[PDB]
Amino acid sequence: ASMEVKTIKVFTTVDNTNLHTQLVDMSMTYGQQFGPTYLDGADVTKIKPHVNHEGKTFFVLPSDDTLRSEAFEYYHTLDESFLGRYMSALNHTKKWKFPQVGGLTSIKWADNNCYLSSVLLALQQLEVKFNAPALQEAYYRARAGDAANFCALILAYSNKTVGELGDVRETMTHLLQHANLESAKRVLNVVCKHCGQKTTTLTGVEAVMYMGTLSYDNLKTGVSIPCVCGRDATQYLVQQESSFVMMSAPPAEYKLQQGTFLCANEYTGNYQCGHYTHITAKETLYRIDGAHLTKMSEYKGPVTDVFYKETSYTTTI
């Protein structure tokens, strides 16, 4: 338009909470004035300002102490490439569909996001709290059906990109590290027939996840494990302090009886290239597969993860 000095008022941010007013020179690009810049996850580093941009909020990278501090307080990470991978992933997740299925927010399949849909579904049924404000907020919105952000954060925290199939268990591990499980505790009694006995105590994420069996009952009765030497020593739960536990194991035909578990995940296909679907229950058993739901009276299939509700448990040994 009118050839003259033109500068518009926009806002820059790293957490979308603290907004920094900026007067930009329309005669140059965002990159030249802010460095890598984003608008709704879309990279606009190489373009110049538009009047349509007045009053809009742009994401930039932590280029100064204030920004570094703000980004850290919000996301709780020091990974320099975090903000970038997040915007990059959000640029895609914002196009996904998040239908309500069985009363839970699910995700229409796209880009092998079935493992993310399983994670999201599981979370909504667990008493779990995040410490990173970034996740508290995005999670709150996902429960209402607007999970584009929450999905992008999960991808960024577990350092995966849109398109690649991930492992639910492993993804929960990365994710739960930013949850409040500071009071989660597990005490295991190990007994090697030969070399006596000891007691192992796990806390945080390690206190709620187990790999080997899908049965929480077995963990309580005893499960074998390779000893320093000799055979496989026995091990069993003595104390459990958490709002839930997750029992994992390689997919295998398993029967799931309603009332005996919280929710679970089945996986069909080959290692790293199969398909996940979520199993839960309300009035009956529900099989949630993205935007698909199937109600059944009984279930038996390839299960890898089973969640159980917990408060506090102690042995009768």
Ligand X SMILES: Cc1ccc(N)cc1C(=O)N[C@H](C)c1cccc2ccccc12
Place of tokens 């505790």: 185
Tokens 């995966």 locate to: 160
| Number of amino acids touching ligand X (CB under 6 A) | 11
Please select the residue that binds ligand X; options are 251, 263, 266, 308, rule is CB under 6 A: 251
DSSP-assigned beta bridge partners for residue 246:
209, 307
Rule CB under 5 A: say whether 308 interacts with Cl ion: yes
Residue with tokens 């591990």: 173
Residue 278 designated active-site = no
Catalytic one of 167, 178, 278, 289: 289
Instruction: For residue 75, give the H/E element and its range.
Output: helix 65-75
CA-closest candidate to residue 86, choices 21, 132, 144, 28: 132
Is 228 a residue that touches ligand X (CB under 6 A)?
A: no
How far apart CA 79 and CA 66 sit, in angstroms, is 16
Q: Is 266 in the site for ligand X (CB under 6 A)?
A: no
229 belongs to the binding site for Zn ion (CB under 5 A): yes
* 55 versus 259: smaller Cβ distance to Cl ion: 259
State phi, psi for 118 to the nearest 5 degrees.
Answer: -65, -40
Sites for Zn ion among residues 176-195 (CB under 5 A)? 192, 194-195
Whether residue 151 is annotated as binding a ligand: the answer is no
Choose one: 83-91, 141-149, 202-210, 253-261; the region binding Cl ion (CB under 5 A): 253-261
CA distance 261 to 127: 15
**Half-sphere exposure (CA, 13 Å, Cβ side) for 265?**
27
- Is 263 flagged in the annotation as binding? no
Please state the residue numbers annotated as binding site for Zn(2+).
Answer: 192, 195, 227, 229
Residues in the site for ligand X, rule: CB under 6 A?
165-167, 250-251, 267, 270-272, 274, 304
Please state the residue numbers annotated as binding site.
Answer: 192, 195, 227, 229
The residues that are catalytic are: 114, 275, 289
